[PDB]
Structures are given as C-alpha cells and as structure tokens.
C-alpha cells in the first residue's frame, strides 16, 4: 500500500510551495521482497504521539522514534506501534518516497474557534540528515527553505485541521435524527488504496476536513529496521517532525503565543519477519513523555558551521546566541559516549562570551 505517484517535472504553484522532493522514489538499499504482510486489527488504532501547547514563531521538534514511542490516548504500557517492535526483530518498509523508505503518516489536528487565525508549517526530515532538523530548531534556518514543506492555514472560517470519524458499525446509523452520517458506512466502503470521496462528503464539507499530513521516512542506507538503541545513537534512522505556527492573531489584532495542537500517527506500511519470544532486552518505551534527539559524533562540524554562517548568532541578547554559547560549552565538556543530546544544549550553564568559548574548544 501507500503508493508512489509520479509528479510532473515542474511543480504547479497552486498546490506546492517547495519543489518536489524527487521525481522518483529512492528504493535502493531496502529489501522489499523479504518479509510477510501481517494485517492485524491492532494496526488500525492511531497513536496520539504529541499533545499539548506549542510556541508560535519557533520550530518545535517532535522526535518520532517509533520503537520507544508513547501514546497519550491510552494508559497502557504498550500501544499499536510499539508492540509491533516488541513482537518482531525486522520491520521492512513497503514503499519509498523522495527522502527514504516510508513507514507511516502523521496527522496534525487542532480544534480552534473562529476568533483566532494563523498558519502551520510542517515537515518531517528523515534523521539521516539531523543537521537540517537541528538548524531549524535553533532558529538558524526556516522551514520554507527545504524541499517537502507544506503550509496549511488553520483559522478560521477554515475547515482544515479537524478529525471526523463516523463510527465503524455495520448498521451505518441509518436511523439518525435530523441529519446524515457522512462517510461512515452505508454510504461507501472506500478502499484504502483508492482515494475518493464517498458520495456524501462531496456536499457536506464540514465533515470532509482537508487534513494536515505528511509521511514518516526512515533513512536510505539500512536494509530493514532492526532496532538496537546503541547503533541508532551512532547512525540515526527514525525521523523528526518539525512544526512551526507562524502568525496567529486574535480578534483584538493581538499576536498570540502557545497554541494547542495534537499529533496522530500510524505505521501501516511495514512487513514483518523474525518473530521473537521471551526476550530480555526490549525497546523500553519511556513512560509518559517522549524520546529526545541524538546528535552523533560526525554531526558536530555541521551544526558548528551553520552557527558560523549566521549573522544573528554572534550578536548578544538574541535567542540564537543563547544556543550557540550552550553549544560551545557542551563541546568543551567530557563525553565518555560518542553523541550528545538536544537536552544537553538546553539545560547547560553559561560563560563569557563567544570567542573565548571557541579558543578553549580548539584545544580540547
């Protein structure tokens, strides 16, 4: 499933704000003829990966590490995506895209009243290139400058980021008082491969809800998706979702901050192999929060270069100069391991000021 549509040579500006990621998928190195498709009903539950408030005019990272992921719409220990990583050793992507092999989609949704109005920039970078993720988080670069970025305007008078399910019962709710159940069942049984409207979500459009969604790529060198958690700190595989709310004014023409959103995810694009029994080392889902980000050893000079080619990171009192003094301090620390964390570049101490942080770093 989850096809590979061929675009045109030139992208039409009325649909896309960036060029296309590629004109063909990138299915080398992935061993697609290897597993066995395993469609159980547990795969059809989505996962509430992120829920909460998100600051306006700042890129927010959502580390989308599906092996150790937590579900905020469920109180249990495992969920629909992480139990798939408990049961099997090998997960094999079905198809691919312009970034890498792709294993799922995400969905951003936000129920807003009509008195606020803004827009959302979103992109999901594979994690083979985490520099482009981290440079966007630190305010050094914007999301509009990398291919694959979409813009969706949640306001509104606008029916964009919204979820409408219409329950999967065999009755279809044919005796409903004062209105029609739109797109539920006993309208159309639209296939997962096809992409159509039912017939009733063509004149409704409150229940049609043009979604804010992308895909979940992994990385373009692995053959399958065997998770070890020591190897993926050295060569990361799982992607990172980048979200940026831009304008968001109120009816008093006052710029808002910290809007509420929530992100759903599913992984319905994989094949399985090597079913495992009574194992000891498990992928250890962290309770109640998240994963963080891993910056490996060979990514340091790429993060270092992007601060240096930024005129705003040198002047004091700005947000980029805070991260850059926190970045130079962590490089002068003592690391027994071969990677640092984004949280280490947020909860660190401070010195004075920029140049002496670099002279002490070329000696260490």
């Amino acid at each position: 499933s989850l096809p590979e549509n061929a675009p045109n040579a030139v992208s039409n500006p009325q649909q896309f704000i960036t060029p296309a990621t590629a004109l063909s998928a990138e299915e080398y190195n992935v061993h697609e003829a290897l597993g066995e498709t395993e469609e159980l009903e547990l795969d059809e539950f989505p996962v509430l990966v992120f829920k909460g408030n998100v600051p306006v005019d700042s890129v927010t990272s959502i580390p989308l590490d599906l092996a150790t992921i937590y579900d905020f719409a469920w109180d249990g220990e495992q969920n629909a995506i992480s139990q798939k990583f408990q049961r099997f050793a090998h997960l094999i992507p079905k198809s691919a895209g312009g970034f890498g092999p792709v294993i799922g989609n995400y969905t951003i949704t936000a129920n807003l009243p009509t008195g606020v109005a803004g827009r959302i920039l979103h992109n999901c970078l594979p994690g083979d290139c985490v520099d482009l993720a981290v440079s966007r988080i630190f305010g050094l670069k914007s999301l509009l400058g990398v291919a694959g970025t979409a813009v969706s305007a949640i306001g509104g008078p606008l029916l964009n980021g919204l979820v409408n399910t219409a329950a999967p019962i065999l009755s279809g709710a044919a005796h409903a008082i004062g209105g029609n159940v739109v797109g539920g069942l006993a309208d159309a049984v639209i296939d997962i491969g096809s992409n159509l409207l039912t017939p009733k979500e063509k004149e409704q459009p409150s229940a049609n809800s043009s979604a804010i969604s992308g895909d979940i790529p992994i990385s373009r060198f692995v053959e399958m998706l065997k998770y070890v958690k020591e190897n993926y700190q050295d060569n990361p595989v799982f992607p990172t979702l980048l979200v940026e709310p831009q304008n968001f004014i109120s009816n008093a023409m006052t710029a808002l901050k910290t809007i509420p959103i929530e992100v759903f995810a599913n992984m319905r694009n994989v094949k399985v192999e090597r079913n495992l029994f009574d194992r000891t080392v498990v992928p250890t889902v962290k309770e109640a929060t998240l994963a963080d980000i891993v910056i490996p050893n060979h990514m340091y000079g790429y993060i270092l270069r992007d601060f240096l080619q930024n005129k705003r990171a040198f002047q004091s009192g700005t947000k980029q100069n805070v991260y850059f003094q926190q970045f130079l301090t962590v490089l002068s620390q003592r690391n027994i391991r071969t990677h640092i964390t984004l949280n280490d570049i947020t909860s660190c101490s401070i010195d004075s000021e920029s140049i002496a942080n670099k002279i002490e770093r070329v000696k260490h």
Partner: protein
C-alpha cells in the same frame, strides 16, 4: 540411517485438528492460515494470531514416572495472566490483551481453542502410554505412546459443560468468552508403563501453539503484566454474598 532407536508414532496426518491453521512445517518467514469460524453467523475480521501460530512455545515440564494410583492430574493453562507467556517482544498474551472477545473452532462438535504438543524422547529401555483428556469433563481422549508425538486441542474451562459457581448465561449460549475468562486445562495420567533398571524418570515438555483461537473486538494494547496484587482471581471467580 542405521542406528538402534525406538522413535516413531502416528505421523500427524492421521490426527484430526486442522493442519492448515496448525501447520506441521511452516515456511521460514510465512504466516499461518486463518482458522475456521464456529458458525457462519458470528462476527469476523482479519486474524491477529498468524505469526504467533507458527511457534511452539515452551510452557511446562511434566515428569513421567511409574504410577501408583489411578487419578488424573490437571494442567491449567491461563493465557491471560501467567508470567511465562508474557515475557517481552512477541509473546502469547498479546492477542488476549488487544481484544474483548475470543473463541475457537467447532470442527469436532464443541468449541476447542488452544492446542498443546507432547513430544516424548525415550531410550529403548522404557515403554508406555500417556493418556491426555481434553478437559475436566468426559471429553475426547488422546493416547501418547512413549517415543511419539501428538497434538491436543483443548476445551476452555467455561465450555466444558459443568455447572460451576460462576456459570454465566452467555457461557452456554454464545461462542464468545470475554477474554480474561478463557483459561483452558487438560488432564493427564500414565496409563501404561514398563521399564528396566536403567532409566526411571523420562522428563517431557509441553509446547503450546495458540492454534485456532479467534478474536472479535480490537482495542489498543493493554499493559502486559499486573505487578501489583495477585489476589485478583479470588475477587473474580468466587463472588461472596
């Protein structure tokens, strides 16, 4: 090809369970077949037990000595709350904690969910027959010669016909068994035995594929092991006034 051995049994083509839902030799990364429904009027879905039904899992070891009395011996298999079938990764409790209802197949005339394999290695200096009863009630009997292999599908304890203290009306009327009350149990005894002065013990193991179990209502995965209090089965199956 030339060694003195005492191995050989029924050659499982002659056994009567399914041989496609419980495959004799599945291919290395393939998935097993979906089992048959009890009746055409129940709800149906895609199976979530396909990869799990290709794996005989180590459950328990029983010792096969010279019997003294004539009594049976009950082996209780509760796949819902048992810290041997819930380890990490792909364990057997995973279909029983994603679902609300569960059932089996009615190919023999009664519902019969989980299957157990008893394979017996023996030296040539011991011989005998193990007798395995399908449930607590006077159900079907499987005879296991020493040095042979057999598979025994098991009745759930709910559907054995006996009137117990719990005994809900949906137990005799519905084939759907709310998943936490789905324990199965078999009885065994040694029915024939002869030996020499060389061996006396003859330990065997019980393998536990979850063949022809079905499920109905797909929830989101519940927590694996209840590490709080183990008194919960007494507040579940006794029900004081």
């Amino acid at each position: 090809d030339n060694e003195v051995t005492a191995e050989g049994g029924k050659l499982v083509q002659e056994l009567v369970y399914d041989h496609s839902a419980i495959p004799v030799a599945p291919v290395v990364e393939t998935q097993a077949e979906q089992p048959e429904v009890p009746v055409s009027l129940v709800a149906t879905r895609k199976n979530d037990t396909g990869h799990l039904a290709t794996k005989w899992y180590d459950f328990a070891k029983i010792s096969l000595s010279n019997p003294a009395n004539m009594n049976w011996t009950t082996l209780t298999i509760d796949p819902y709350n048992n810290v041997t079938l819930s380890r990490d990764g792909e364990s057997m409790v995973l279909p029983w904690r994603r679902n609300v209802w569960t059932t089996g197949s009615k190919s023999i005339g009664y519902i019969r969910t989980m299957v157990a394999q008893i394979n017996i290695p023996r030296p040539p200096q011991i011989s005998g027959v193990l007798e395995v009863k399908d449930s607590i009630n006077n159900s079907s009997i499987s005879l296991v010669e020493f040095g042979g292999k057999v598979e025994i599908p098991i009745i759930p304890k709910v559907m054995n016909g006996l009137a117990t203290t719990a005994s809900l009306p949906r137990h005799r009327l519905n084939p759907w068994m709310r998943t936490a009350e789905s324990k199965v149990e078999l009885q065994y005894r040694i029915i024939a035995f002869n030996r020499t002065s060389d061996i006396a013990d003859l330990n065997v193991s019980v393998l536990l594929r979850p063949g022809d179990s079905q499920f109905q209502l797909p929830m989101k995965p519940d927590n694996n092991v209840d590490t709080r209090h183990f008194e919960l089965v007494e507040a579940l199956m006794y029900h004081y006034d």
